[PDB]
Amino acid sequence: VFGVTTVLTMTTLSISARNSLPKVAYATAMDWFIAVCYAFVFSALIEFATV
Amino acid sequence: MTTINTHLRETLPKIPYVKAIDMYLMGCFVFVFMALLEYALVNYIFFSQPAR
Numbered sequence: 001v002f003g004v005t006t007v008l009t010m011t012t013l014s015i016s017a018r019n020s021l022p023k024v025a026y027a028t029a030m031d032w033f034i035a036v037c038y039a040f041v042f043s044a045l046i047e048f049a050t051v
Numbered sequence: 052m053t054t055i056n057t058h059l060r061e062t063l064p065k066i067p068y069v070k071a072i073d074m075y076l077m078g079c080f081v082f083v084f085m086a087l088l089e090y091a092l093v094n095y096i097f098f099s100q101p102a103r
């Protein structure tokens with residue numbers, strides 16, 4: 001529930017977060033930060049799956 | 052999936068036909084739905100045989 005609920009919160013923050021900037025077709029710096037953080041959360045969950 | 056679908060749907064008109072993005076979201080939903088149903092089926096015959 002740790003892993004999956006933090007992935008769900010990452011989804012909620014990212015959906016909330018996309019209302020700030022316009023609908024640009026390229027990746028911004030906040031988009032890179034959110035992507036790397038989402039990757040870290042997903043990596044933590046898959047690591048739990050492995051353990 | 053439901054949260055994603057409801058949050059990214061209201062930025063378009065109320066068009067009847069199925070868009071590509073609506074098709075993809077419904078595909079993702081049916082995939083996770085059948086995954087949960089598959090788990091339910093695994094749990095239904097878990098007490099009887101663990102091999103299957």
